């Protein structure tokens, strides 16, 4: 896998060049944003169970076809598997936020996931709706101004929204 | 790591088709040589699906297709013949 | 399908390295005795019909109940004698195959593997084939290294059937 | 290990053992050899009759529908493995048998035993058996196509040094098995695995001692690993908690009486 | 696998007939060139590392884009895999020479090698060029007149060349 | 596991010197003995099932307590395991005759067999009696003058008898 | 422990059979060889000190690494223990020659000797070399025609050689 | 086990010294006497069945109560008669073993040590075995140097049982 540094390292080794001034300056800016990135990872991790439970509540409230007898998320076994799937997707989104590159999210969670959900009969649009709800919950929790020092965090929120849209698009 | 296990429905078999299995620091651990990297077909039950996916993913393999079988038998694998 | 050469390559490939002088000596023993094996296979190919008929006669001599008890497993009718004769012909033909190959490999994939289930399911006594192979041992008539592989493959199927 | 160590330890044939890999498009001889190696190692060198030979999973290998790992899993999940190693055995012994058969290893620590016991209690025998085959160690060591083999006598990447000494307590020899009379065996590692220590190896020619004129009428010595405590009478000053006694046949009953009167527990008695 | 004997054994078993006199005379001829076969196997085995290293040097001499930063042979791991592939291909050509039949080479080396190289991105034309280079290196080693008993060895040289063309055609 | 050669090689490498000429001459003597050795191995292998069956029948003629209900060789399973042990001991005797050294017996066949027979409740003296009876049958098989060229074979018979006595002494 | 008579006595008692005529005739042959056996025991006992001193001198001439400061046989006590070890091994070889069985040599001297030499850091290959030198010294002294009545004594010399070979193999 | 050779080696090993001329004289007496011991053991081996049956019969003559009254320790049934014949066969076989070994070592290791606890536990009378050994003294038929060997081991077991 790669993080925000080793992705640029792998690109430079493919090109066979040393890093220029612009790439090192971009990586230094990423290091400057790194504390905000770790704050985002900490907040989503600390409210992960709340995010998964509230997203499951809203998903099966707006889509009651899944929890009804016969629905995929019906039966405590399949429901526990669905809650595990929300927890796994949120966990790998936090992993991709931590690395700063989505290599862990593509290569470790989203690869074969669409074919998994097609072979299982899992409706991937419902999973994408749950990922959208985890996105809005996590972006509200990151952007909470209380209990943390002031600063601009539009870049990391945009990156987390990109990771969440990547997770939702891989199952849709 | 799943609730599927200890269940009859968790004996539902699937076939994973994985590509790109190559040596890597993640693969440097292995004590045996890998002989094929083209298209490896692995039969996996439902209970064991989480373990197989992580294992395939940990080694860097890319999953291309997962075919359901609608059976507990691995008979429609038909790849090594 | 085991021979000197195939097991030499399989051993070297299980080692994951090249063909050392061990496998070269294996090939030298194969070359040393392969001419006698080919001569033995030629002689049994020439005398195949006579030795199969004599082996079937020896089986009927030691086990006369096969020729008089009515049954699908027995040789009381002409069908049972034809099946017994072609079974002994199979045994002799895979013996000649083992002589050509230079190991018990043709016996292992053609005849030895699963023969317990064949004799159990169709109620074939293995002592019939034991007496047939002892006739082939008694009357193949080779000398030197040709007889020594001939006794090797014959007693291999003797030991597997008993 | 090398020749001089393995000749004393009786593990020469383990060191000259080649891991069988079932390559693609294998001949029936190679599939038969893989099946026989799995029945020797997974079923612990038991005399396996043809009446419980698992013809279905054998045909699934022959068919190439399952991998070598699947066959190992099928064999370990069968009732042959359950009768031979699970039903009449305690949990510690069964977990050690699983490690020896599936992973080719002795267990390293007590938290591994606690994890496997908790996994048995939470998910059944099938879940527990899967734990070993679907582990990182199995995939790395054998993977999909290599028959598992004993790796406790070689230097492993993530291994504990106590695993080498415990492998001799688990692997008793080449012409040994894991079957006992009545199929119920007690674990030899529970004293050390719980306490995170090791025992002396004493395997084969390692167990021997010099007899001389001190062996008695029968020229043989007996080797006694005994945990010693303070005597209530305090007659003799005890210098070590774990003590070694080399005593003859003519004094073996007397020495056992001495150890029993001292209140000390006997942990091992062997020839020497 | 098969050798020169079990090939015609399997053909005669599939026809269900004994070997005729011409088949046994052909096998006696194979025994006659068996000593030259053992000589060729021993010479390629004894010069295998030099053959692999010289073939690699020529291959990266007139195809330098493999070793270029970003090339398929660039990075120690990829070059070690390249030299290991050369060693495996040469070893399996010696295996097929030893057996007298290309069953082991086609069934345990060339079986699945092409889509392996396709999935990795390995350029199979350059692999076939390296196999060709090992072919003239091995046939130059075999046909060295010095230190060997004189005799005609065109059959075993043509058979080794045929095994090398089967190895090169299976990867191109 | 050693042969007649590598045992002397192992003690010489432990001493750190080349083989003296007396050791080379003794190894040449064993090379000249090797044809009779291969004859003995082939004869015991050819009559292995007869040797095992005859020794089993005459052992239970000697010891009827083994197959008696409650005996160690009673029940098909235990009888089948006993018969496998008899043919395994005969097989490893052929192995030790083949190599010319008994390292395969003490390293594979008798490695923990005493402990196994003590743990199973197997009477090892009865196994040693069966090994002596297989020894008598195999020595009558090897020293049979019919169907072979003449020669003095007391050395290979004494070596086979030594392997059999070491196999019997390990279980008794 | 056993002698030549009591070995076959114990082997017959383990089978519960009387000694057959062949075993009694073999013991009668042993009784016939016993005078030469006593002569061999007497000769090795007489020249024991010469055997030990000359073989130790030859061993440290061939292996000067043992007497060098830091060597195993360095220091008078370790050198004494060396000469004592050679004398004890000779004494037990004479005991085994006297009894006609190696029960005393293997059971009282060779059992656990390898473990002791390993635990002390004693090179057992050097012990085996010294025991081998004592072997040709003892068979040179035993087979000396001078001062004794003539007769074929190859069997007792081979038996002493076997005792020395199992003494050297028990430490190598 | 106790023989002249084993005693000589045990004493020389206890003193940590080589085998002197005393041990050579011990082996010389063993060698001179061993041929008559082996001939005595051969004759007792050949006459063993008749001697054991006659010894059991003589015990039944001196002690008829062992054949009439019921009891596990008595020979009134066929099981007790088989046990008595097996016991006297054990005694005679160990006497032959002592004849071969040249000392009372087989008696001391196989029969003498613990026979008091056997005769006490299983209610066997040592007088029965004393009469059996006395019948072996009466009808072994050896003469000369071999007879004094046989009678020494028979009286050693008699003196141990009485
Ligand atoms: C037969 C003459 C006697 C007899 C035998 C008997 N053996 C067993 C069980 C085992 N025997 C072995 C021995 C080996 N296994 C090997 O792989 C090798 C080669 C290195 C040897 C020498 C083993 C391992 C076992 C146990 C495992 C198994 O059964 O496969 C039994 C069965 C005992 C039981 O209760 O299960 C028996 C009966 N028994 C006799 O009475 C004869 C004197
Ligand atoms: C010198 C004053 C006279 C002399 C000496 C001589 N010595 C030896 C042999 C040995 N000497 C020793 C002594 C020691 N070894 C030790 O480790 C220590 C303690 C550190 C001591 C004191 C030993 C062990 C030997 C024998 C082993 C060996 O050769 O090293 C010899 C050789 C004897 C032989 O037979 O090879 C000689 C000649 N000789 C004289 O004439 C001087 C008057
Ligand atoms: C015969 C003279 C009279 C007789 C004998 C009788 N003996 C027994 C039982 C046992 N005898 C022995 C003796 C030995 N066992 C040994 O191993 C050896 C050394 C080789 C000896 C001498 C033993 C051990 C037993 C008991 C165990 C067993 O049954 O084998 C019995 C049976 C007693 C019982 O209670 O079952 C009998 C009847 N009885 C007579 O009346 C004769 C005068
Ligand atoms: C067929 C097997 C099966 C079971 C057993 C099952 C249980 C189950 N009960 C749930 C919710 C719930 N269950 C309750 C139940 C109660 N609240 C109370 O105060 C009462 C004391 C109590 C009733 C005894 C409530 C209030 C919720 C809603 C929780 C939420 O939306 O957050 C949910 C969450 C999803 C949903 O809203 O439907 C599941 C999956 N589902 C299954 O498929
Ligand atoms: C390594 C990372 C990883 C991923 C990504 C993963 C996905 C995953 N989800 C699964 C099942 C499942 N996933 C769901 C999920 C849902 N059903 C719905 O209706 C909702 C739309 C949705 C939740 C939002 C369900 C219901 C199953 C069980 C399907 C079945 O039992 O038939 C399975 C089958 C194996 C098993 O559950 O044990 C896998 C492998 N497993 C992993 O280890
Ligand atoms: C081990 C647990 C641990 C963590 C996670 C941690 C994080 C952490 N976040 C910091 C800053 C910060 N964190 C933020 C983050 C944000 N500001 C906002 O208004 C947004 C709501 C939000 C984005 C999610 C900002 C803007 C800073 C100051 C700039 C910077 O230091 O990078 C600092 C600098 C010290 C400080 O001023 O507080 C630390 C140490 N310290 C710890 O000990
Ligand atoms: C937990 C981490 C760990 C440790 C500590 C460890 C030690 C270790 N050292 C070993 C062997 C060995 N170790 C040595 C070492 C030496 N010989 C000498 O003369 C020197 C004094 C010394 C080097 C300084 C040798 C020679 C062997 C091989 C012994 C043999 O095979 O005969 C072995 C036997 C297995 C093998 O050969 O791989 C182990 C397990 N292994 C481990 O996994
Ligand atoms: C889960 C239960 C299960 C099934 C159902 C099963 C079927 C099965 N049958 C097979 C082979 C086979 N099956 C046959 C059967 C026959 N040929 C004929 O001509 C007849 C029409 C017919 C019998 C009446 C043959 C000949 C093969 C071997 C094919 C070959 O090796 O070339 C194989 C390939 C592996 C092997 O050779 O054993 C499988 C997997 N295996 C299983 O475990
Ligand atoms: C990115 C990771 C990486 C490394 C490290 C690497 C090393 C590397 N160095 C090579 C050759 C070489 N390297 C040298 C180097 C030297 N000769 C000398 O005399 C000097 C003292 C010394 C320099 C310090 C030479 C002379 C060759 C050519 C060898 C040949 O053609 O036979 C080759 C052979 C292939 C080729 O010709 O390019 C490789 C693969 N390749 C890689 O992809
Ligand atoms: C274990 C190692 C070992 C090997 C490999 C070996 C091979 C070997 N090659 C031989 C012959 C031979 N080898 C060749 C081979 C060739 N002649 C040529 O001019 C070509 C350059 C070349 C083809 C590569 C020929 C022509 C013969 C003589 C014909 C024959 O014996 O088949 C012979 C017959 C004895 C002799 O005349 O030398 C042996 C023993 N002997 C051994 O001990
Ligand atoms: C409790 C499970 C069990 C079974 C089944 C069993 C069978 C069994 N039957 C045997 C022999 C035998 N069985 C027979 C039987 C017959 N001969 C005939 O002509 C008849 C037609 C037929 C009767 C139906 C004979 C003749 C032997 C002796 C074979 C021999 O000594 O060579 C033997 C050989 C050992 C011995 O002599 O006792 C075994 C082990 N043993 C067991 O422990
Ligand atoms: C692949 C099967 C095969 C085998 C096993 C084989 C063995 C074999 N044994 C031989 C010789 C021999 N074999 C013996 C053996 C014995 N002589 C006796 O009287 C004893 C009964 C007996 C000991 C068991 C002797 C004495 C020789 C001649 C000396 C020698 O060649 O070493 C010879 C030399 C050629 C000959 O004169 O026959 C061969 C080739 N040849 C083959 O093709
Ligand atoms: C049952 C009869 C018996 C035997 C067999 C025996 C062997 C024996 N040899 C020993 C020591 C020894 N043995 C040697 C021998 C040698 N060093 C060399 O370099 C040479 C290769 C070789 C002379 C041939 C040495 C040097 C020691 C002392 C090791 C030490 O303490 O440092 C010791 C340690 C105890 C002691 O200090 O004496 C024993 C027990 N002891 C017995 O009671
Ligand atoms: C107490 C001290 C003592 C001893 C040891 C002793 C031994 C002794 N050795 C003898 C014979 C013998 N000794 C030998 C021995 C040999 N012949 C050879 O040419 C070989 C060099 C050598 C083997 C080491 C032979 C061949 C005989 C004659 C055969 C025999 O009597 O057994 C004899 C028979 C009488 C005679 O002819 O001299 C005696 C008494 N006598 C005693 O008073």
From Swiss-Prot, chains A, E, F, G:
UniProt feature coiled coil, ranges: none
CDD domains xref list: PC_PEC_beta
Alphabetized SUPFAM superfamilies for the sequence: Globin-like (SSF46458)
One Pfam family linked to the record: Phycobilisome
Electron transport as UniProt keyword: yes
Binding site for (2R,3E)-phycocyanobilin 2: 153
Keyword Membrane in annotation: yes
Annotated binding of (2R,3E)-phycocyanobilin 1, by residue: 82
GO biological process terms, semicolon-separated: photosynthesis
UniProt PTM: Contains two covalently linked bilin chromophores.
Subcellular location: Cellular thylakoid membrane
Predominant cellular place of this UniProt entry's protein: membrane
Gene Ontology CC annotations of this record: phycobilisome; plasma membrane-derived thylakoid membrane
UniProt modified residues of type N4-methylasparagine: 72
Annotated membrane topology: Peripheral membrane protein
Family: Belongs to the phycobiliprotein family.
Functional description taken from the UniProt entry: Light-harvesting photosynthetic bile pigment-protein from the phycobiliprotein complex (phycobilisome, PBS). Phycocyanin is the major phycobiliprotein in the PBS rod.
Subunit-level organization: Heterodimer of an alpha and a beta chain, which further assembles into trimers. The trimers assemble into hexamers, although these were not seen in the crystallographic studies. Part of 2 PBS rod complexes, the conventional CpcG-PBS rod and a photosystem I-specific CpcL-PBS rod, both of which include ferredoxin--NADP reductase (petH). Interacts with rod linker CpcC2 via the latter's N-terminal PBS-linker domain.
This protein's name: C-phycocyanin beta subunit
Source organism of this protein record: Synechocystis sp. (strain ATCC 27184 / PCC 6803 / Kazusa)
Gene designation per UniProt: cpcB
UniProtKB/Swiss-Prot annotation, chain B:
Top-rank lineage group of the source organism: Bacteria
Triggers of expression: By light, and also by 0.55 M NaCl.
Cystines in this chain: none
Transmembrane segments: none
Subcellular locations according to the entry: Cellular thylakoid membrane
Ranges of residues in domain CpcD-like: 11-69
Description of post-translational modifications: Acetylated at the N-terminus; 6% of protein in CpcG-PBS and 12% of protein in CpcL-PBS is acetylated.
Signal peptide: none
Phenotype when the gene is knocked out: Essential for growth.
Subunit structure: Purifies with both the classic phycobilisome (PBS) supercomplex (CpcG-PBS) and a photosystem I-associated PBS called CpcL-PBS; it accumulates to a higher level in CpcL-PBS. In both PBS it can be cross-linked to both phycocyanin subunits.
Family: Belongs to the ferredoxin--NADP reductase type 1 family.
Protein name (record): Ferredoxin--NADP reductase
Organism in which the protein naturally occurs: Synechocystis sp. (strain ATCC 27184 / PCC 6803 / Kazusa)
UniProtKB/Swiss-Prot annotation, chains C, H:
Gene Ontology CC terms, in alphabetical order: phycobilisome; plasma membrane-derived thylakoid membrane
Origin superkingdom: Bacteria
Membrane topology classification: Peripheral membrane protein
Main location class: membrane
Binding site for (2R,3E)-phycocyanobilin: 84
InterPro entries xref list: Globin-like_sf (IPR009050), Phycobilisome_asu/bsu (IPR012128), Phycobilisome_asu/bsu_sf (IPR038719), Phycocyanin_a (IPR006246)
A Pfam family annotated for this UniProt entry: Phycobilisome
Key word Transport present: yes
GO terms of biological process kind: photosynthesis
Post-translational modification, as annotated: Contains one covalently linked phycocyanobilin chromophore.
Cellular compartment(s): Cellular thylakoid membrane
Entry keyword Magnesium: no
Keywords: Antenna complex, Bile pigment, Chromophore, Electron transport, Membrane, Photosynthesis, Phycobilisome, Thylakoid, Transport
Subunit structure, interactors included: Heterodimer of an alpha and a beta chain, which further assembles into trimers. The trimers assemble into hexamers, although these were not seen in the crystallographic studies. Part of 2 PBS rod complexes, the conventional CpcG-PBS rod and a photosystem I-specific CpcL-PBS rod, both of which include ferredoxin--NADP reductase (petH).
Family: Belongs to the phycobiliprotein family.
Function (record text): Light-harvesting photosynthetic bile pigment-protein from the phycobiliprotein complex (phycobilisome, PBS). Phycocyanin is the major phycobiliprotein in the PBS rod.
Protein name: C-phycocyanin alpha subunit
Organism: Synechocystis sp. (strain ATCC 27184 / PCC 6803 / Kazusa)
Classification of source organism: Bacteria, Bacillati, Cyanobacteriota, Cyanophyceae, Synechococcales
Curated annotation (Swiss-Prot), chain D:
Domain of life: Bacteria
A Pfam family matched in the record: CpcD
GO CC, alphabetical: phycobilisome; plasma membrane-derived thylakoid membrane
Stretches assigned to the PBS-linker domain: 1-179
Outcome, altering residue 32 to R: Significantly decreases interaction of PBS-linker domain with phycocyanin beta subunit (cpcB)
Effect of residue 140 to R: No change in interaction of PBS-linker domain with phycocyanin beta subunit (cpcB)
One annotated GO biological process: photosynthesis
Outcome of swapping residue 46 to R: Significantly decreases interaction of PBS-linker domain with phycocyanin beta subunit (cpcB)
Keywords: Antenna complex, Membrane, Photosynthesis, Phycobilisome, Thylakoid
Effect of residue 40 to E: Significantly decreases interaction of PBS-linker domain with phycocyanin beta subunit (cpcB)
Compartments where located: Cellular thylakoid membrane
Domain CpcD-like: 219-272
Record InterPro entries: CpcD-like_dom, PBS_linker_dom, PBS_linker_sf, Phycobilisome
Effect upon mutating residue 25 to E: Significantly decreases interaction of PBS-linker domain with phycocyanin beta subunit (cpcB)
Bilayer topology term: Peripheral membrane protein
Subunit composition and interactions: Part of 2 PBS rod complexes, the conventional CpcG-PBS rod and a photosystem I-specific CpcL-PBS rod, both of which include ferredoxin--NADP reductase (petH). CpcG-PBS has on average 3 stacked phycocyanin hexamers (PC, CpcA and CpcB). Linker CpcG connects the PC stack to the thylakoid, the hexamers are linked by 1 copy of CpcC1, 1 copy of CpcC2 and the stack is terminated by a single copy of CpcD. The CpcL-PBS has on average 5 stacked phycocyanin hexamers (PC, CpcA and CpcB).
Primary gene name: cpcC2
């Amino acid at each position: 896998m790669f993080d925000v540094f080793t992705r640029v390292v792998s690109q430079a080794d493919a090109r066979g060049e040393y890093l220029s001034g612009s790439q090192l300056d971009a990586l230094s800016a990423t290091v400057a944003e790194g504390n905000k990135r770790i704050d985002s990872v900490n907040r989503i991790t600390g409210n992960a169970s709340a995010i998964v439970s509230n997203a499951a509540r809203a998903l099966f409230a707006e889509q009651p076809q899944l929890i009804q007898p016969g629905g995929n998320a019906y039966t405590s076994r399949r429901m526990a598997a669905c809650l595990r799937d929300m927890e796994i997707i949120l966990r790998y989104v936090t992993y991709a936020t931590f690395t700063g590159d989505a290599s862990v999210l593509e290569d470790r969670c989203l690869n074969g996931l669409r074919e998994t959900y097609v072979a299982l009969g899992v409706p991937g649009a419902s999973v994408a709706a749950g990922v959208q709800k985890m996105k809005e919950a996590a972006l509200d929790i990151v952007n909470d101004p209380n209990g943390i020092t002031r600063g601009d965090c539009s870049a990391i929120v945009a990156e987390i929204a990109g990771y969440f849209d990547r997770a939702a698009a891989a199952v849709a | 790591a799943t609730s599927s296990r200890q269940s009859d429905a968790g004996n539902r078999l699937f076939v994973y088709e994985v590509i790109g299995l190559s040596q890597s620091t993640m693969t440097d651990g292995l004590d045996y040589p890998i002989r094929r990297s083209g298209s490896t077909f692995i039969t996996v039950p439902l209970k064991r699906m989480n373990q197989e996916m992580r294992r395939i993913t940990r080694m860097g393999g890319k999953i291309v297709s997962i075919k359901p079988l609608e059976g507990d038998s691995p008979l429609p694998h038909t790849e090594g013949i | 399908m085991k021979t000197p050469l195939t097991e030499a390559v399989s051993t070297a490939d299980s080692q994951g390295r090249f063909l050392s002088s061990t496998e070269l000596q294996i090939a030298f023993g194969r070359l040393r005795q392969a001419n006698a094996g080919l001569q033995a296979a030629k002689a049994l190919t020439d005398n195949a019909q006579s030795l199969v008929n004599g082996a079937a006669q020896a089986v009927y001599n030691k086990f006369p109940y096969t020729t008089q008890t009515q049954g699908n497993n027995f040789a009381a009718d002409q069908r049972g004698k034809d099946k017994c004769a072609r079974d002994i012909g199979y045994y002799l033909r895979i013996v000649t195959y083992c002589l050509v190959a230079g190991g018990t490999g043709p016996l292992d994939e053609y005849l030895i593997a699963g023969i317990d289930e064949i004799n159990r399911t169709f109620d074939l006594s293995p002592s019939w084939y034991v007496e047939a192979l002892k006739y082939i041992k008694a009357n193949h008539g080779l000398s030197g290294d040709a007889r020594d592989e001939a006794n090797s493959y014959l007693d291999y199927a003797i030991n597997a059937l008993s | 290990t090398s020749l001089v160590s393995a000749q004393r330890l009786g593990i020469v044939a383990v060191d000259e053992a080649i891991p069988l890999e079932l390559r693609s498009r294998s001949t029936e001889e190679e599939v038969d050899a893989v099946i026989l190696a799995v029945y020797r190692q997974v079923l612990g060198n038991d005399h396996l009759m043809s009446q419980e030979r698992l013809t279905s999973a054998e045909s699934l290998l022959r068919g190439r529908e399952i991998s070598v790992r699947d066959f190992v899993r099928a064999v370990a999940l069968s009732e042959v493995y359950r009768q031979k190693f699970f039903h009449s055995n305690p949990q510690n012994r069964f977990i050690e048998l699983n490690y020896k058969h599936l992973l080719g290893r002795a267990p390293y620590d007590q938290s591994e035993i606690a994890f496997h016991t908790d996994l048995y209690h939470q998910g059944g025998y099938e879940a527990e058996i899967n734990s070993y085959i679907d582990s990182v160690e199995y995939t790395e060591n054998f993977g999909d196509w290599v028959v598992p083999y004993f790796r406790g006598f070689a230097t492993q990447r993530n291994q504990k040094t106590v695993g080498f000494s415990r492998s001799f307590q688990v692997y008793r020899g080449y012409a040994t098995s894991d079957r006992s009379q009545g199929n119920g065996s007690r674990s030899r590692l529970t004293r050390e695995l719980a306490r995170n220590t090791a025992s002396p190896v004493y395997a084969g020619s390692t167990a021997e001692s010099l007899r001389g004129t001190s062996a008695g009428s029968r020229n043989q010595m007996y080797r006694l690993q005994v945990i010693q405590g303070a005597a209530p009478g305090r007659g003799t000053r005890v210098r070590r908690g774990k003590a070694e006694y080399l005593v003859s046949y003519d004094n073996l009953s007397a020495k056992l009486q001495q150890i029993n009167r001292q209140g000390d527990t006997v942990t091992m008695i062997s020839l020497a």
